[PDB]
Amino acid sequence: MDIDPYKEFGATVELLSFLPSDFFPSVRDLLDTAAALYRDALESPEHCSPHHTALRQAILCWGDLMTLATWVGTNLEDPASRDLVVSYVNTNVGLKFRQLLWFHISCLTFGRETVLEYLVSFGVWIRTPPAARPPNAPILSTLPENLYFQ
Amino acid sequence: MDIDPYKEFGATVELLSFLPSDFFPSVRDLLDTAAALYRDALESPEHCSPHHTALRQAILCWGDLMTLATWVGTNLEDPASRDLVVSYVNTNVGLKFRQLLWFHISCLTFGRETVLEYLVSFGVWIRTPPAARPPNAPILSTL
Amino acid sequence: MDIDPYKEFGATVELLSFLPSDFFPSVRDLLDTAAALYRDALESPEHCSPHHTALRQAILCWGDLMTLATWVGTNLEDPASRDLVVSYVNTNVGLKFRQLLWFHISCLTFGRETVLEYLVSFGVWIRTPPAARPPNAPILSTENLYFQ
Amino acid sequence: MDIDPYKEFGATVELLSFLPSDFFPSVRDLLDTAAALYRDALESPEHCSPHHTALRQAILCWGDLMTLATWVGTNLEDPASRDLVVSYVNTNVGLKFRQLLWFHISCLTFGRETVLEYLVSFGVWIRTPPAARPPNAPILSTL
Amino acid sequence: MDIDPYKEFGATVELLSFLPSDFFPSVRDLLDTAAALYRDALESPEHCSPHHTALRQAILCWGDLMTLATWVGTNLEDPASRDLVVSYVNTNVGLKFRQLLWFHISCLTFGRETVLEYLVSFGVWIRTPPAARPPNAPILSTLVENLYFQ
Amino acid sequence: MDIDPYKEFGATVELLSFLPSDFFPSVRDLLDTAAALYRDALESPEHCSPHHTALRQAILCWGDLMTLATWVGTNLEDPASRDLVVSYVNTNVGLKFRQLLWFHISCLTFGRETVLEYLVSFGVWIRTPPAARPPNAPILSTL
Numbered sequence: 001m002d003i004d005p006y007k008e009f010g011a012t013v014e015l016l017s018f019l020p021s022d023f024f025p026s027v028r029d030l031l032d033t034a035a036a037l038y039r040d041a042l043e044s045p046e047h048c049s050p051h052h053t054a055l056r057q058a059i060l061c062w063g064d065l066m067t068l069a070t071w072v073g074t075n076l077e078d079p080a081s082r083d084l085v086v087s088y089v090n091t092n093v094g095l096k097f098r099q100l101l102w103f104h105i106s107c108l109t110f111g112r113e114t115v116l117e118y119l120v121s122f123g124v125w126i127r128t129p130p131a132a133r134p135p136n137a138p139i140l141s142t143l144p145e146n147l148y149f150q
Numbered sequence: 151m152d153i154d155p156y157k158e159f160g161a162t163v164e165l166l167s168f169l170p171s172d173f174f175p176s177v178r179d180l181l182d183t184a185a186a187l188y189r190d191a192l193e194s195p196e197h198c199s200p201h202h203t204a205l206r207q208a209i210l211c212w213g214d215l216m217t218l219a220t221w222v223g224t225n226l227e228d229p230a231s232r233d234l235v236v237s238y239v240n241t242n243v244g245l246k247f248r249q250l251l252w253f254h255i256s257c258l259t260f261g262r263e264t265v266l267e268y269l270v271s272f273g274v275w276i277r278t279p280p281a282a283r284p285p286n287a288p289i290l291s292t293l
Numbered sequence: 294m295d296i297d298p299y300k301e302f303g304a305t306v307e308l309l310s311f312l313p314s315d316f317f318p319s320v321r322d323l324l325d326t327a328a329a330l331y332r333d334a335l336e337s338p339e340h341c342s343p344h345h346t347a348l349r350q351a352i353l354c355w356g357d358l359m360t361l362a363t364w365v366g367t368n369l370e371d372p373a374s375r376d377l378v379v380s381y382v383n384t385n386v387g388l389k390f391r392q393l394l395w396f397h398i399s400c401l402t403f404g405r406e407t408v409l410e411y412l413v414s415f416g417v418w419i420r421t422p423p424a425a426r427p428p429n430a431p432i433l434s435t436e437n438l439y440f441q
Numbered sequence: 442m443d444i445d446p447y448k449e450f451g452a453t454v455e456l457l458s459f460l461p462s463d464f465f466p467s468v469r470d471l472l473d474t475a476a477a478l479y480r481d482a483l484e485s486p487e488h489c490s491p492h493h494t495a496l497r498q499a500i501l502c503w504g505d506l507m508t509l510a511t512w513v514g515t516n517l518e519d520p521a522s523r524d525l526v527v528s529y530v531n532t533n534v535g536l537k538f539r540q541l542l543w544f545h546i547s548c549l550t551f552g553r554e555t556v557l558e559y560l561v562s563f564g565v566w567i568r569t570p571p572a573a574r575p576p577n578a579p580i581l582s583t584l
Numbered sequence: 585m586d587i588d589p590y591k592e593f594g595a596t597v598e599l600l601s602f603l604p605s606d607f608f609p610s611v612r613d614l615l616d617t618a619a620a621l622y623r624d625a626l627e628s629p630e631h632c633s634p635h636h637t638a639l640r641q642a643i644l645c646w647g648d649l650m651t652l653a654t655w656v657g658t659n660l661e662d663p664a665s666r667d668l669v670v671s672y673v674n675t676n677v678g679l680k681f682r683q684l685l686w687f688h689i690s691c692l693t694f695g696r697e698t699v700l701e702y703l704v705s706f707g708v709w710i711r712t713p714p715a716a717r718p719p720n721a722p723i724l725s726t727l728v729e730n731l732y733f734q
Numbered sequence: 735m736d737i738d739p740y741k742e743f744g745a746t747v748e749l750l751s752f753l754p755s756d757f758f759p760s761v762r763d764l765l766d767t768a769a770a771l772y773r774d775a776l777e778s779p780e781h782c783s784p785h786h787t788a789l790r791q792a793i794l795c796w797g798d799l800m801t802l803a804t805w806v807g808t809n810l811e812d813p814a815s816r817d818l819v820v821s822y823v824n825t826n827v828g829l830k831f832r833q834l835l836w837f838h839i840s841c842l843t844f845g846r847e848t849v850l851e852y853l854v855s856f857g858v859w860i861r862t863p864p865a866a867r868p869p870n871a872p873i874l875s876t877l
């Protein structure tokens with residue numbers, strides 16, 4: 001099976017990968033923001049939206065990954081091996097979940113169409129030589145609805 | 151935050167806990183069954199349903215967990231240590247995903263109300279002394 | 294005072310005693326089932342029914358008994374004596390609570406008349422020689438108002 | 442499961458625990474009084490009331506605890522050991538049942554509203570410095 | 585800034601000082617009583633009254649004072665001395681909070697006017713020589729021509 | 735009892751916790767600001783507002799805490815142990831009172847809704863990577 005978690009939301013893994021890793025907040029800061037803005041909906045008995053359903057699973061999945069990675073660290077006897085697991089998590093699944101958590105949080109706040117336009121706008125800006133581009137980054141909020149019955 | 155992945159679907163972690171671990175198919179068999187029955191919908195650009203959205207994420211999350219567990223597992227020198235990872239996965243996160251994958255697959259096939267009733271029916275049957283209960287288990291599809 | 298806990302529910306200790314101890318689920322499984330089926334009602338501020346009121350007390354009483362039995366076991370010097378406490382609890386008060394919890398859970402699920410008939414049906418079946426009786430046991434399944 | 446035995450009766454464990462242990466009659470005296478006032482109803486085939494149903498179970502539960510504690514005591518050779526069991530029962534589960542038996546007996550005699558008001562009145566009186574408060578305690582039957 | 589916590593409630597520190605320390609229940613007993621009588625209101629999202637707002641803060645402030653003293657005691661010296669040195673909280677600020685907690689609880693129960701008059705009545709009684717005064721203290725809760733206008 | 739001092743004002747401890755500690759002025763600067771802006775109201779015989787009542791108690795509570803912390807500090811002139819008192823205050827109760835004093839002062843000046851929106855705006859801004867966000871912080875007074 002070949003499932004792209006962005007495809008039902010009108011995006012792709014390749015489109016999120018257009019952004020450099022430095023664009024994304026940390027996982028902990030994304031999780032804090034999801035709580036600050038959406039805790040009640042995420043904890044509610046209501047689906048709310050496909051974005052809420054996906055964001056719930058992504059939050060819990062990161063917890064699963066951290067529980068496994070922590071248990072692995074607990075059994076490692078070499079301090080350099082423990083560093084290897086951390087660096088493996090941060091370099092691989094960490095970036096994947098920063099992309100994913102950011103995508104759902106930003107879509108819930110600003111809308112898919114605005115988010116996809118911002119992804120392109122920032123990705124083009126950061127690829128322009130710094131001496132040739134505007135000094136500040138484009139701003140997500142400065143950019144210019146199905147009811148999901150079941 | 152305290153998110154119960156079953157709550158938006160009318161269930162709870164505690165309710166799935168009512169079933170013994172032996173009730174659930176293996177993760178591999180659950181994944182094979184999701185593919186055999188729902189591959190086209192799971193891979194489509196349509197949400198289809200909240201169960202599809204959740205099942206998509208659970209399938210991908212298990213992939214993430216297995217890539218990590220395999221990467222650790224292939225690099226261990228002691229077979230007692232590899233048995234420790236396998237036994238840790240099977241006893242903990244493996245059981246969580248058997249519950250979760252089974253819940254979404256069964257709901258996609260039979261509907262929430264049938265699944266919740268079956269959860270209780272089987273959990274009650276298996277707790278009845280074997281000499282006092284019907285020889286065969288209750289059947290999910292019947293009702 | 295001589296109170297039979299079944300009497301207000303149309304039964305007696307002697308009638309529950311007609312069933313062999315192997316008939317009843319374990320206490321842990323009865324408690325799990327009470328939660329799976331009746332957690333919200335048992336925890337609610339409403340009486341719900343006389344069975345709910347009695348089942349609430351039985352659940353908490355089992356907790357009291359286990360706290361006492363656990364405390365006794367930890368403080369006994371002789372480990373063989375600790376084993377005897379466990380076996381004494383299981384053979385005596387444990388069986389009493391399996392009967393009691395089963396009675397209220399079954400009554401809430403199937404009603405008093407079905408339960409009382411089933412207790413006699415199973416009690417008669419298990420006393421029939423196995424070679425002379427049906428191979429499978431009888432099946433139990435095959436908001437009320439409460440007067441006094 | 443988290444069951445508060447007072448909740449269906451409009452009270453809580455925390456409210457009963459507002460009263461110091463010395464407020465409550467002994468378990469033996471509560472059982473004597475339950476018999477003197479309510480023996481026929483408690484032994485009858487009728488529910489009578491939710492308080493009667495709960496009080497029946499509380500009386501029998503204390504019997505279970507005493508049967509267990511007595512069996513333990515008869516099997517302990519050391520008197521100091523038997524003394525500690527007696528003191529443990531009275532200090533812990535004994536207080537729980539003094540609260541519980543008193544609550545049901547008082548409610549059957551005076552009604553829940555009167556009982557709850559009295560709990561607060563006595564709990565406030567006993568917390569007032571003795572030199573600053575009325576010499577006698579408030580009276581349950583008044584008002 | 586010189587804030588008297590009683591001034592907005594029609595009293596002063598000097599007036600509460602008229603009562604001897606023996607008059608007041610203990611802090612623990614005042615806190616137990618606030619819960620027994622006012623837990624739901626104190627925990628609610630409604631202001632309820634100025635007395636409720638002030639009492640909420642006093643309860644939490646006592647917690648702050650005890651948390652600090654306990655944390656220091658846990659990391660001061662070995663336990664032989666650490667507990668009794670920080671029993672200063674009870675020795676000084678303990679009376680201040682007994683006054684303050686009692687003031688808010690009594691006002692919520694009986695009203696400011698009854699409380700202030702009772703403060704004076706008890707303070708006068710306790711200052712009268714015991715051999716010359718009534719044996720029992722005045723009572724906080726205390727105080728037929730309605731037939732004519734029948 | 736579980737009292738959240740923000741709850742009657744439409745907030746929670748966890749919401750204030752969304753802000754980094756560096757966001758808040760010092761306690762001393764919050765107190766000097768409360769005096770410059772609200773000394774007369776805070777010292778008046780009128781309630782003025784629920785925020786005034788709460789802020790009065792918080793100001794006085796900090797006085798209680800510092801008298802205690804100084805008495806604790808003055809007793810043992812061992813630098814490590816002394817530096818633990820100030821470091822415990824700075825990391826724990828000092829931060830609690832910076833949050834609380836700021837919340838009441840900002841609410842008195844700009845209103846609850848402006849304050850709550852600003853908390854989220856700044857908390858989100860500071861979590862955006864510095865190279866990707868506007869160079870200056872959002873401004874509390876700008877609606």
Ligand SMILES: COC(=O)C1=C(CN2CC(F)(F)C[C@H]2C(=O)O)NC(c2nccs2)=N[C@@]1(C)c1ccc(F)cc1
Binds near residue numbers: 399434435
């Ligand atoms: C809600 O409980 C029930 O419904 C029960 C059923 C439901 N039955 C379970 C079964 F598999 F045997 C078939 C089914 C039926 O009667 O159709 N059966 C029984 C018993 N049967 C024989 C000895 S105890 N007890 C409970 C009350 C029971 C209570 C607690 C427990 F853990 C197990 C069973």
Ligand SMILES: COC(=O)C1=C(CN2CC(F)(F)C[C@H]2C(=O)O)NC(c2nccs2)=N[C@@]1(C)c1ccc(F)cc1
Binds near residue numbers: 173174183255
């Ligand atoms: C699409 O899935 C199903 O339909 C399933 C059926 C369908 N049933 C399989 C059966 F042979 F037991 C009879 C049939 C029925 O109820 O008529 N049964 C079950 C379970 N039954 C007992 C424990 S798990 N799970 C799934 C969801 C299930 C899911 C994944 C898997 F690998 C196996 C079963």
Ligand SMILES: COC(=O)C1=C(CN2CC(F)(F)C[C@H]2C(=O)O)NC(c2nccs2)=N[C@@]1(C)c1ccc(F)cc1
Binds near residue numbers: 516
């Ligand atoms: C394993 O042994 C026991 O269970 C027992 C021992 C073990 N004792 C040690 C021994 F080996 F010398 C034989 C026996 C004895 O004193 O005769 N002693 C007793 C006593 N009853 C009255 C006075 S002592 N009861 C139990 C059954 C007893 C039962 C429950 C309990 F909690 C404590 C003791």
Ligand SMILES: COC(=O)C1=C(CN2CC(F)(F)C[C@H]2C(=O)O)NC(c2nccs2)=N[C@@]1(C)c1ccc(F)cc1
Binds near residue numbers: 614
């Ligand atoms: C709700 O609190 C009260 O009602 C109180 C009463 C109620 N009175 C208790 C009494 F027994 F003395 C008689 C009764 C009355 O006035 O009729 N009395 C008092 C005090 N009286 C003297 C010194 S403190 N304080 C509180 C506020 C009080 C507050 C907390 C506490 F723990 C004890 C008393």
Ligand SMILES: COC(=O)C1=C(CN2CC(F)(F)C[C@H]2C(=O)O)NC(c2nccs2)=N[C@@]1(C)c1ccc(F)cc1
Binds near residue numbers: 547
């Ligand atoms: C039937 O029970 C009662 O009526 C009771 C009365 C009746 N009062 C006994 C009295 F002497 F104090 C006067 C009388 C009254 O209120 O007029 N009082 C009390 C208590 N009062 C204070 C602490 S417990 N409990 C019971 C429920 C009570 C229950 C069991 C028991 F053993 C003792 C008291």
Ligand SMILES: COC(=O)C1=C(CN2CC(F)(F)C[C@H]2C(=O)O)NC(c2nccs2)=N[C@@]1(C)c1ccc(F)cc1
Binds near residue numbers: 868
């Ligand atoms: C609710 O989230 C947002 O509103 C977000 C904003 C809001 N913007 C933050 C800002 F300071 F850069 C200005 C403001 C705006 O667009 O006006 N911006 C961004 C990003 N911008 C650049 C790289 S990520 N992400 C989130 C979804 C974001 C998500 C989580 C997180 F922790 C930080 C930011």
Ligand SMILES: COC(=O)C1=C(CN2CC(F)(F)C[C@H]2C(=O)O)NC(c2nccs2)=N[C@@]1(C)c1ccc(F)cc1
Binds near residue numbers: 757759763840873875
């Ligand atoms: C009355 O207090 C205020 O008005 C405040 C202003 C007023 N702002 C100060 C400024 F220079 F940043 C611009 C101005 C504005 O929003 O236009 N800003 C802030 C904060 N801003 C960011 C972190 S705290 N807090 C207070 C409540 C504040 C409270 C106490 C204190 F000491 C400093 C600031």
Ligand SMILES: [Cl-]
Binds near residue numbers: 003004
């Ligand atoms: Cl794809």
